[PDB]
Amino acid sequence: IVGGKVCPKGECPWQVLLLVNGAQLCGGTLINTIWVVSAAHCFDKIKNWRNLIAVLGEHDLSEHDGDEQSRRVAQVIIPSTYVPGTTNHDIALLRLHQPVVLTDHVVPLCLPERTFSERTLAFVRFSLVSGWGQLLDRGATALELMVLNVPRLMTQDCLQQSRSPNITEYMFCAGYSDGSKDSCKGDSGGPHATHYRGTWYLTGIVSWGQGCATVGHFGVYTRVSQYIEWLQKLMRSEPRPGVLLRAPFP
């Protein structure tokens, strides 16, 4: 996260850190005790699926304070329509091997109904994006969890205001074009969270694209609303052997 601030400990309790062989991979979002939403592209280069760990209740990477909960990842589910090394359909659903325990420091973000998300949430201007990603383009990653308030653009407006992959119906733009504020490498998979009448909801996933905090460009986010029904169906399904599962979309 570029141009944000430290998320005070416990104020982003749905934030997930994904590790591979102990190394930072990506972010994610807890949506219930065994389910995490992330970005498909995070898994493009994974060799050994068994070395994937999800951490809840994390804050400061430099220390252990006892609020952290680590879990193995049992399943990584990706839509059939996702093509590695690209941007469209950039979403993954992860099943944890064992549930996390909800605490003051570990709480799921609400996965909204599609209609609600489309009719209401989509029109809330500002939303929060978070992660332990790069603090600057070509810079070091953050040791403490960072958060940033970004405004959402209608796709027509995004295109107009921009000056590259297409912006599809499965995406949206948010942020700033002045190169001051953005999500960045290391943040992918993390939440774009939207507040409505006293509760927070999952509306986007930090995806990827061209540079971070590049002048003339906005951040690109996976449009979660397009996937609600897909996610819900999968959450009702039994696990299958072998970590990676490609599931038909729609």
Binding site: I31, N32, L102, V107, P108, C110, T115, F116, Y196
Partner: protein
């Protein structure tokens, strides 16, 4: 009332029905109040609420 407008007055989720009918609903871990619009937690750690902040104002 219609769901497309002002969220049908619902705090959370909204369904249109046949007629001048509307029903509000709530996410798991919440229940609907008698006003037919408001949602109240039923568990300790409902989704989308921040405990240290809920406490901060409790």
């Amino acid at each position: 009332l219609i769901c497309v407008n002002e969220n049908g007055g619902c705090e959370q989720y909204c369904s249109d029905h046949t007629g001048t009918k509307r029903s509000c609903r709530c996410h798991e871990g919440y229940s609907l109040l008698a006003d037919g619009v408001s949602c109240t937690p039923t568990v300790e750690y409902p989704c989308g609420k921040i405990p240290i902040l809920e406490k901060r104002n409790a």
